[PDB]
Amino acid sequence: ELWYRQIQENDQLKLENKGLKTDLREKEEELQGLKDDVEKLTADAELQRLKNERHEEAELERLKSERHDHDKKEAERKALEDKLADKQEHLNGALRYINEKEAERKEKEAEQKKLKEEKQISDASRQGLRRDLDASREAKKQVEKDLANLTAELDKVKEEKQISDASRQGLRRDLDASREAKKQVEKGLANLTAELDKVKEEKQISDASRQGLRRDLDASREAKKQVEKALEEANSKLAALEKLNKELEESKKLTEKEKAELQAKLEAEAKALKEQLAKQAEELAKLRAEKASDSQTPDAKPGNKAVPGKGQAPQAGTKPNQNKAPMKETKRQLPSTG
Structure with missing residues (x-):
């Protein structure tokens, strides 16, 4: 935390920085009022990573400190993306635009260089x-x-x-x-x-x-809400099927229990509703926004059989079947309860 060449240089007056232009930016280079990822220099790509994000720490100060901060030549670190990322043989995108954002103010001409009275x-x-x-x-x-x-x-x-x-x-x-x-x-x-x-x-x-x-x-x-559908943790589980519980809630209000063949759903589908549940208590991936399943059985053993089921499953599981990978010595070997 040193400081050599100790002449009194710190705060000063009137400010407009420069480039140190090892270009990976296109324009608006390292100038930290209009900062190093505030727009389209190295590592502030469009589609929502400008100062809009919850920082300017992808504010890739490496544009001048290219070899003086982190010698990746720029990004792929403090700014978690690749440069502007803009220019190479796909001239097809982003639609630079102008618009009629005109508040119907007066209709004007310029025989005076247009100094009309807009009041x-x-x-x-x-x-x-x-x-x-x-x-x-x-x-x-x-x-x-x-x-x-x-x-x-x-x-x-x-x-x-x-x-x-x-x-x-x-x-x-x-x-x-x-x-x-x-x-x-x-x-x-x-x-x-x-x-x-x-x-x-x-x-x-x-x-x-x-x-x-x-x-x-x-x-x-x-308008804002008028398209609303839900992609919360995409499982309420038993409650969307709570019509099973009709034949089990009818057994407590008044005396019942005729043929027991129909009670093979109440506590039978609930059987599959611990794999379904242990999927619910974990995560989403029903609604689109890219979805389907990685967790409806490829990882549903946790809780079901209680072992990780990917990457050379550990020795737990009640039916372990492999001993070939990096790991933490698990069952015959022992951490705390396996």
């Missing part, structure tokens, strides 16, 4: 940025928890893009019909924005406003 046509724009827009993207943001279950076991009948959709159109209906809550939160302010006639386009100061807080600010009520 409440622009107060409407800035109120749209509040109502037209806020609560319109959390209605769009079905992207980091619900992204798993927009379509559940259905034969990939695309619906994930049709319920969050009503919010990605929520900057058009918002921008012109919650821009009711602007084109009238903006003239109900004053008649300088042409407000329609009669004595009841005057309640609309707040009613076209409520159209906003019903179309844009409740866009967070309509």
Whole structure:
């Protein structure tokens, strides 16, 4: 924890760093205000690993400290991915975009280099940025928890893009019909924005406003959840079949027990509901989001037979069958109870 060449160099004034450009970055290199994985230099790949993640520690400071921090030349360590990862002969992706995110502000020309008077046509724009827009993207943001279950076991009948959709159109209906809550939160302010006639386009100061807080600010009520199906620990087990327990719950309320052939399901399927259970008490993998089974028997012995069942099974199990691998000496040899 030394410090040699001890001239008083530490904090200083006015800041704009540079590259030390051993490029593995494309652009926005090691500059730690716009940091080493804050965008698309070495090891901040798109598809959600920018400063969006819960750190900048994939903030790959190796771009300048390429051989001075960890000589992997950059990533595959502190930033758990490969560089920008961008450029090689697959020119087919990522759709760089521009959009009509236009809050229907005034229609303008440039015979003065366009210095028009946007006054409440622009107060409407800035109120749209509040109502037209806020609560319109959390209605769009079905992207980091619900992204798993927009379509559940259905034969990939695309619906994930049709319920969050009503919010990605929520900057058009918002921008012109919650821009009711602007084109009238903006003239109900004053008649300088042409407000329609009669004595009841005057309640609309707040009613076209409520159209906003019903179309844009409740866009967070309509769309976001409207595609909801569950990929929790994907087993409630005995409870989805609790109709077995009809013939065993009928044996305690009142006296019964006619033919006993039908009691070969109550405590018979429950027999397979310790392998099924010990799968439940373990994990998911019923619903899509990539699924099927690695644990419904390839690892169901734990609890069932009580031994690991992969990679040269240990000597436990009540029927062990191998003694060839690295391990912890297990049964004839002994750790604590086997």
